[PDB]
Ligand binder design. Structure first.
Ligand SMILES: Cc1cc2nc3c(=O)[nH]c(=O)nc-3n(C[C@H](O)[C@H](O)[C@H](O)COP(=O)(O)OP(=O)(O)OC[C@H]3O[C@@H](n4cnc5c(N)ncnc54)[C@H](O)[C@@H]3O)c2cc1C
Ligand SMILES: Cc1cc2nc3c(=O)[nH]c(=O)nc-3n(C[C@H](O)[C@H](O)[C@H](O)COP(=O)(O)OP(=O)(O)OC[C@H]3O[C@@H](n4cnc5c(N)ncnc54)[C@H](O)[C@@H]3O)c2cc1C
Ligand SMILES: O=C(O)CCC1c2ccc(O)cc2Oc2cc(O)ccc21
Lengths: 461, 461
């Protein structure tokens, strides 16, 4: 049994970040990874998605060339040109991450880890056993797919993983789901030319976001050509002579349900959820607590119910973002190896950007969450809706919506929600202000930068 | 003599903002304007400039279409298509501003105001006299041009005002000056296809900005095809059979001066400075203090040396920006009509964006200003330089540079300077944080938004 100071299971966002910071502090660390370093984000997540979003953005702005005095570009987009440069970029990142571990003297153990029945927590990878007084589980998650028993033919559809393997742009695509991944995929496929439908169980997408955002985002999707199929779900899928045929039931409240067949579908993409990667760890051997979905239960310090075993990232099922796994991973390294016992991540005020068209930026409480926490009488919101100056001269239009949620007499800014051009790069700084406890007066006393869309947030009345 | 509670001279950024806020507080106000409402910003400043910058941005990104899998767009940009839509937009804004004054019951007196010899401050506009216990001078400024005596033929060149009258893209252009207006004009003309030279007296542009920015900005200009002529100045200009011929002297320190003739110049644009609009006000009649350049001297509350007379905006010659004139104008209205005697603008930490390619964002102290204010031992800077993810797949590259200037033990963030894609919309929030007194730890404890360029500012080490 080879011993280390820190054993990290999973070489993704949280695992690499934690192992590297631990090493800086003097810990002899090893990272176990069965697949590719960089994990979900680098390989089939944030990075390849952003490159594809940058591609879709070019496609949208191209609609505006003639309005700006430029000649029209004839036609056909070539998916494989960008797909290949994208894959190459991911290969470059994998090599960089490997180099980063080696330069920090972190040992990389390749293979699938699983806990053993040994008394003191011990894992086995390819027949060999490894142990450490501190073991971090950062195995992340994976796309969820319907069971063939509940939806016959579900296995004919792909997940976001499959999206990154596509070598040609699908002609007709149906995305099922209403969360940010679904919205992003629908927006990229549609911008690039696929006849796209987004199937949702209710009437709006991103239902956990402030209502101004779910409402505005659903409308922008429709305005951009995405067919949003409301109150609908797949009953079954079948392979026809030319594509898939999707049977769906649409049950709009107050109407009779209606069954419809969507024919000649080239791509059915399930974007219904993520499931934690814990089934093959043999957690049961140590009695590590999980919820019924398989997520590992942890306290505020990322401790599991078993001493010397921690968990961070997607596997814990809360705030499924790369920077969250990274921040939690680092805070944990400081707690264990620098002895800062108060080192832990504050899960409040975590900012998020959804790469839709236009992008969405959000941090803090939605209006309803603030109303429930402070009381209707103590919540005041300020909002604005305008057409960015960029569209002053175009036939195509997008809107920019912003909402500021304030609480109490002092009007502490507890939430900022917005959608519009530039919102993706605009959020970080306001997130710093919100984390500091800014009030509306702090925003109001900051001189505006003109002409920008960002200045609207410091001049709300 | 018609009397009012508040008489504003100049219907531009600061004048309109001050008159409107005063009216909201109950003051019977009148605005004097001899030209077009909206002033410099709306008519020949911020607005038409931003539309032209948005146009140049399309031109630059077009270089990247083929890398992203799109077909190449053939050729010719048509200047007059956008020029006309731009003019129309400015007309729409002028009508909006007029409507805003009328709806607030602010009287608009058209014509040129000049003070009289009357004891109590009184102005005359087209033979009629007007007075008020509070008179605001917000006459702004105008482009500066060389005297024919110092530079024969200087009158053959145009200023930024003339830039907005151009109906065709000049084939060859020479911009003289090294401030932000010069840099912006050079960048738009070059992006749109003009063979452009930028003539500067030294070796770098924007010499008052942090050195990381002046250095990086000069290089980006050169990389983008702008010919930067260092240590050079115009000796004379003459009209030839086909364009202008510019004689310039280049005196690089440590070399002999050399005289050069730049022939076939279509457009010579002077971007050497701004001069305050005070010569025709008859300020001398009331003994209102001005400096030798004609700027009106004011204290921290915008008071002149004469009671009941104030000045805000460009005419005061400090922080020549639209939002500054607006903020000062409003703070003054609250002081006079709401009796908030502490109401005044803090001229520190005013943020600025230069619409270059890529754009520049800056707020606070440069490294040298911080070194002089706190002492070398008490200043720590953090910087980074990277190529944005957007260029991971392109042959063309731009850089993103960021610098954070911290002071004292706590590392109070006293300055943020950056240049790169997205920096124009990224600055506002960090400006709010800096105004609040954020330290490096506040930035460091804010969870990053991935993948963006903005996340680099919260992960500097
Ligand atoms: C389509 C998509 C787009 C996304 N876009 C964004 C975005 O733009 N911004 C953002 O912040 N977040 C985004 N996310 C979320 C982000 O990818 C995750 O939050 C993040 O990857 C979670 O990191 P992690 O360390 O928890 O796990 P992961 O990154 O998934 O890493 C877990 C690693 O552990 C390895 N592993 C698993 N089991 C074992 C085992 N038993 N033995 C050995 N190795 C094992 C896996 O191979 C994997 O490499 C996106 C996700 C998806 C799916
Ligand atoms: C090319 C250019 C680009 C710029 N871009 C930006 C930018 O992107 N962002 C930014 O913040 N700033 C920008 N600025 C600066 C900004 O335009 C000024 O800071 C702002 O206009 C100053 O406002 P003001 O109220 O002081 O004066 P002005 O806006 O100039 O208004 C003064 C008004 O008073 C009127 N007037 C003058 N004398 C009299 C008189 N005696 N009687 C009656 N009426 C009179 C004038 O006609 C004018 O309308 C730019 C300026 C220029 C030149
Ligand atoms: O297709 C084009 O010519 C414009 C591309 C483009 C763009 C254009 C104007 C503008 O004001 C902003 C802007 O932002 C982006 C951002 C991207 O990631 C890609 C293209 C752009």
């Amino acid at each position: 049994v080879a011993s280390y100071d820190y054993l990290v299971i999973g070489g993704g966002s949280g695992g690499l970040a934690s192992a590297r910071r631990a090493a800086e502090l003097g810990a002899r660390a090893a990272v176990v990874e069965s697949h590719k370093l960089g994990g979900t984000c680098v390989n089939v997540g944030c990075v390849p998605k952003k490159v594809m979003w940058n591609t879709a953005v070019h496609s949208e702005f191209m609609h505006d060339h003639a309005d700006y005095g430029f000649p029209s570009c004839e036609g056909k987009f070539n998916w494989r040109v960008i797909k290949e440069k994208r894959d190459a970029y991911v290969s470059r990142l994998n090599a960089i991450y490997q180099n980063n571990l080696t330069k920090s003297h972190i040992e990389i153990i390749r293979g699938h880890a699983a806990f053993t029945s040994d008394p003191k927590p011990t894992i086995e990878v390819s027949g060999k056993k490894y142990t450490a007084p501190h073991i971090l589980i950062a195995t992340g998650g994976m796309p969820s797919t319907p069971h063939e028993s509940q939806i016959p033919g579900a296995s004919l559809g792909i997940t976001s993983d499959g999206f990154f393997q596509l070598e040609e742009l699908p002609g007709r695509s149906v995305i099922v789901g209403a969360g940010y991944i679904a919205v992003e995929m629908a927006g990229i496929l549609s911008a690039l030319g696929s006849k796209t439908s987004l199937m949702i169980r209710h009437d709006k997408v991103l239902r956990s976001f402030d209502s101004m955002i779910s409402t505005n985002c659903t409308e922008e999707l429709e305005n951009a050509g995405v067919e949003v199929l409301k109150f609908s779900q797949v009953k079954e899928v079948k392979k026809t002579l030319s594509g898939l045929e999707v049977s769906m039931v649409t049950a709009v409240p107050g109407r009779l349900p209606v069954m419809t067949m969507i024919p000649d579908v080239d791509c059915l993409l399930w974007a219904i959820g993520r499931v934690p990667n814990t089934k093959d760890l043999s957690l049961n051997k140590l009695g590590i607590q999980t919820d019924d979905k398989g997520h590992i239960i942890v306290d505020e310090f990322q401790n599991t119910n078993v001493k010397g075993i921690y968990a961070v990232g997607d596997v814990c099922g809360k705030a499924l973002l790369t920077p969250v796994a990274i921040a939690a991973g680092r805070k944990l390294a400081h707690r264990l190896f620098e002895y800062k016992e108060d080192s832990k991540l504050d899960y409040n005020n975590i900012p998020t950007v959804v790469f839709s068209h236009p992008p969405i930026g959000t941090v803090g409480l939605t209006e309803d969450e603030a109303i429930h926490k402070y009381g209707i009488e103590n919540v005041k919101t300020y909002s604005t809706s305008f057409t960015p100056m960029y569209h002053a001269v175009t036939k195509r239009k997008t809107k920019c919506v912003m909402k500021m949620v304030c609480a109490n007499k002092e009007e502490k800014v507890v939430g900022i929600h917005m959608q519009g051009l530039g919102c993706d790069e605009m959020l970080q700084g306001f997130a710093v202000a919100v984390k500091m406890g800014a009030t509306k007066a702090d925003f109001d006393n900051t001189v505006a930068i003109h002409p920008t869309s960002s200045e609207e947030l410091v001049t709300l009345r």
